[PDB]
Amino acid sequence: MKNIIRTPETHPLTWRLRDDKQPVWLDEYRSKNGYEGARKALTGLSPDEIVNQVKDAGLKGRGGAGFSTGLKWSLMPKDESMNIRYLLCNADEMEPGTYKDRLLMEQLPHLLVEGMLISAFALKAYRGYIFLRGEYIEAAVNLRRAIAEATEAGLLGKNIMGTGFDFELFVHTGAGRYICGEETALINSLEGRRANPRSKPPFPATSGAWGKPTCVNNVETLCNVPAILANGVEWYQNISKSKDAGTKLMGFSGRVKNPGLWELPFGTTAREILEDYAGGMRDGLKFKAWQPGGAGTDFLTEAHLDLPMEFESIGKAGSRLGTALAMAVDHEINMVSLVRNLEEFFARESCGWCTPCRDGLPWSVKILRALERGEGQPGDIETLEQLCRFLGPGKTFCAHAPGAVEPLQSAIKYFREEFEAGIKQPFSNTHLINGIQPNLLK
Amino acid sequence: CPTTAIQLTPDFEMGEYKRQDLVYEKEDLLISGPGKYPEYNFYRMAGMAIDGKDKGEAENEAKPIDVKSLLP
Amino acid sequence: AFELSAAEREAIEHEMHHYEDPRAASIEALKIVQKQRGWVPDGAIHAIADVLGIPASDVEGVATFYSQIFRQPVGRHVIRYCDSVVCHINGYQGIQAALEKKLNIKPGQTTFDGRFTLLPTCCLGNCDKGPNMMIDEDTHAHLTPEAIPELLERYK
Amino acid sequence: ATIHVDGKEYEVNGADNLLEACLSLGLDIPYFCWHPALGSVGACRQCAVKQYQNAEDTRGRLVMSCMTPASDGTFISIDDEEAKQFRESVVEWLMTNHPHDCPVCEEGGNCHLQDMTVMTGHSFRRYRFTKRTHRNQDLGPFISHEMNRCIACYRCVRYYKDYAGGTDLGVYGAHDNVYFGRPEDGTLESEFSGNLVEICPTGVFTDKTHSERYNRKWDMQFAPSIC
């Protein structure tokens, strides 16, 4: 729909959003039912009870992994001597097409503060860190002002409304590398080290930041938790009849008539969003491709537009939902240049730890540059498909490389003819010495 | 030879009066031009620093991008 | 010969007050040096290492790892244009050509008078509002190649 | 513990790594970033094998031998098609940007990278683009340094920081422009910097004293002696 009514029953996140795109401060937040779930958690809810409610509410990961946060919180050790636990908010994105947390932190900072309060009491953590980016400046200013207002209002400090639970919140603005978004590399970057990820299964819930149990959660997860604790769990299961419970900040981007961001329940197909919420595309565009998640997932054709944007529904289509922020590709854009730019971003924004990504993403960049410039050679398409087969999950140290080569998978699978037309000259790897007969095999 | 330095000329008119003078030293082997392979040079393919050849000046070698450079 | 001002030391010590390990404030110390002087010189690595207590190799690696910690000297205004895919679809080659025709330089280099330094950026987080750029912590969206000279004349 | 490699039963230790358990049996698995005295990391992916859980399995999963514990009930495979061609792809990625300067290298016949390139069986090159080059540093009168030969296996900084405790050498760089050394030019003040000649599998850190008046390894008449 062009005009959308944001009642709190169906839009638990953005029903208190302002029309003039102004930040909602503490008084306006408390006027529109603010810190009620936090009050319930910090007065009459046990931390294990909150963990069980989050686990049985069906909330999953919103950073693209899709892993349920209740089972994430159930990996904390049961020893009470490990009371130096930490909570981290992955406010960092640097992902092309991901822009929901910018809105969530520019005009809803107290929702994030309440979410960290609830999750820190649930996880028995005493320190919380919002890992932001240097690109987000107004969001950082609004978050710091919200933290100051919450501290002035007797919250976010020592003995929060007479509980004895001590919690302190800080904002860490990173300098910016895309690998810092992953949880283990976010932990490494938080410790003042280079943002190289860490091996598994030493988990962050057992040994994370400075050897202490930590939990890293997305902005939207911590924005969905206080609505769960303020409105109930059966209400959270009774807003969408799908296996993925809750609402997601969806929206299309890229040469669209209305490229925006709207909160919608799971199970909503991309076609209705594109035609009514996005309003269709501009004049003279035929919608030749789309991507469900921003730049990390893989392309889908027009035949997959009828699929509901869930995790499992796009999982069996040879794809994944990711951040659920869709991106549209038209016929006026060659996918050779587009996938070249994607691989360039992934090659220059990866880390230098493990070999296959390190020395295959620049190789894919150079092969796609040769295909763009018309200098493609026999032995490039099969090289790319062998590269993307060898850059899957488990082969590399982290998951940057499967998300890097998934657009290569979809561009190779669907739009093969453009890459085939990108090859003009024959194979030439060696030049003559004019004193040695070459070993020309036939 | 990976540099095509040691080579076999078609010259065979050899023979010495002493066995001690059949050992050819450096000055008895190095000739004043390229032999059976006229237009090959190894050091245009090597990667080490050479007089008249800085880093990245070899064949199929890019210029050394600085670590401290502003490029992401 | 590098030295640290008093405000730098107070800010760095207050940042180390926020963390369990003083190593965790290295990125923010480099950011403070960047906000005061515009870039991180060679002696700043040893100064941060001596203040924090971690060796200079770790500080050098942190400074050379993250993209927005500049070790080469830059101009007084760092133009950071988007190089990602959404702004590629919306069109960033036009504004890149406009910048290259206005400043007469290449990306990654600074102008001769030290007025601007052109740099690509991984993403800005403003994908829905068209092509985006940042100049001196000021963002700009819905950009057009015709408005680039108008946008570039409001900076010193 | 009891493991099964190549469809054959072996009895190895339970708490150790799979790579060191397989190397203790005399089997050949290539590796670049694992050292017996430095632990195991994932800087390369050279020790890849194919692991199966059940006794009979078809697909399996490509795992790292230095990241898999040698536990009871693992059925791993080494010389199958997929793991061998993946290791060949990893050595190909290491030769993607490697200088063509083997005969002017101080390692030569003492180079681990040559041994693991020949062992994987990779000779044909399909890379036609430009290579990666770096500058050099002066690391004192003992350690000659040149960065082009590196493969970013992180063994030097792991030894020099965690094991040797030196506060000089480290990693400075990025995705592909990754550098291993000193932020300035000067002698490595650590008393154990001379072990970087054998720690480094490549010709980056080499013996300067042996670089002067140099001979190859096969030309060396060795003896077992005491310092």
Ligand SMILES: Cc1cc2nc3c(=O)[nH]c(=O)nc-3n(C[C@H](O)[C@H](O)[C@H](O)COP(=O)(O)O)c2cc1C
């Ligand atoms: C290369 C890479 C980049 C990532 N970037 C982000 C990110 O920017 N934001 C985010 O929330 N998750 C990101 N993730 C996913 C995280 O690993 C993890 O899912 C997130 O920190 C928390 O997940 P959650 O939604 O279940 O809480 C990234 C993962 C990878 C492999």
Ligand code: SF4
């Ligand atoms: S795949 Fe490897 S090199 Fe690439 S970002 Fe992850 S750990 Fe770093």
Ligand code: SF4
């Ligand atoms: S310099 Fe040598 S030891 Fe260090 S990462 Fe490179 S190859 Fe490994």
Ligand code: SF4
């Ligand atoms: S270090 Fe590199 S150049 Fe030297 S022998 Fe080994 S592979 Fe050849």
Ligand code: FES
């Ligand atoms: S793609 Fe340009 S702002 Fe995100």
Ligand code: FES
């Ligand atoms: S030896 Fe196991 S990944 Fe390097």
